[PDB]
């Protein structure tokens, strides 16, 4: 068993995305009502509000080193903001349906976004130009993520697949004499809502409308399903690897956050809320510190 040591809670209308700042004690929270909040979870206070979307904002992420954050909305825009000047700097337009996720790359000057329009887009945020459109999924792309150390992207789609994309050819598109799908991971019998890379091991987690969390393993030449976490009783909204313990975390519309053993895939702990479905979970890049977005706001907690 484990305990949840709550460090901060916001009370709001439904929250969709959360992003930890890497060095300041801040979270961004993007809300179903279109507002983005910036909270200090050390003081427990609201620092700023950012209103630049119409309708839900599902994507939200900080740049790792620049004073920027990116948001992605059901109004199809990918907005880039400066949190020091408190200005919306520009909109990146191109998606033709809801944006589900947006993140910054850790080294290249890139934003990743994915959309119900079935595409993944890569944008150069310095030049403000779309530099790639990754096509292949045949339904909403619910999640996309950069690999932390290799030129890979993993994506999850309501077409029931998880895709791994080789973007090495994209980085070298103009090298002297594009992205391509490397793996199509099939197994879920319903749409896939989320996917995640392990920070150091060649592992992938996915979670879906089949109420399952699946663990996959890859090499440079093959990828395969390893095992399944069973126990959620509604759609699984999100999943991640604990960066510092051999544990899997998932969050679900069944109103629970579940902790699972990475090696056995057995239940370790279940946390429940009485009235709130969970939509998203994230972990701080450094700290044993997690955030979860739900129907009534956001919780920031340690797991002990």
């Amino acid at each position: 068993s484990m305990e949840m040591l709550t460090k901060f809670e916001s009370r709001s209308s439904r929250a969709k995305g959360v992003a930890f700042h890497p060095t300041q004690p801040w979270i961004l929270t993007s809300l179903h009502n279109g507002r983005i909040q910036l909270w200090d979870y050390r003081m427990g206070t609201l620092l700023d509000r950012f209103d630049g979307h119409d309708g839900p904002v599902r994507g939200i992420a900080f740049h790792p080193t620049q004073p920027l954050f990116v948001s992605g909305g059901d109004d199809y825009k990918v907005n880039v903001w400066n949190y020091k000047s408190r200005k919306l700097l520009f909109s990146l337009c191109g998606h033709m349906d809801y944006v589900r996720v947006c993140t910054f790359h850790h080294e290249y000057p890139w934003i990743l976004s994915c959309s119900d329009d079935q595409t993944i887009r890569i944008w150069n945020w310095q030049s403000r130009n779309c530099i790639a459109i990754l096509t292949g999924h045949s339904h909403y792309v619910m999640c996309a993520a950069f690999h932390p150390s290799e030129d890979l992207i993993v994506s999850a789609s309501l077409d029931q697949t998880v895709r791994v994309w080789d973007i090495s050819g994209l980085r070298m598109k103009n090298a002297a004499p594009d992205a391509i799908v490397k793996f199509v991971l099939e197994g879920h019998d319903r749409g896939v809502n989320w996917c995640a890379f392990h920070p150091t091991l060649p592992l992938i987690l996915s979670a879906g409308d089949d109420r399952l969390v699946k663990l996959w393993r890859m090499t440079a030449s093959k990828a395969w399903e390893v095992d399944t976490c069973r126990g959620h009783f509604n759609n699984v909204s999100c999943c991640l690897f604990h960066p510092h313990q051999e544990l899997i975390l998932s969050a679900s519309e069944d109103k629970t956050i579940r902790v699972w053993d990475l090696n056995r895939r057995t239940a370790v702990q279940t946390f429940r809320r009485d009235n709130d479905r969970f939509w998203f979970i994230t972990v701080h890049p450094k700290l044993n510190l997690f955030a979860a977005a739900h129907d009534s706001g956001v919780m920031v907690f340690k797991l002990e």
Partner: peptide, 4 residues
């Protein structure tokens, strides 16, 4: 629908 995943609208929520």
């Amino acid at each position: 629908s995943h609208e929520d």
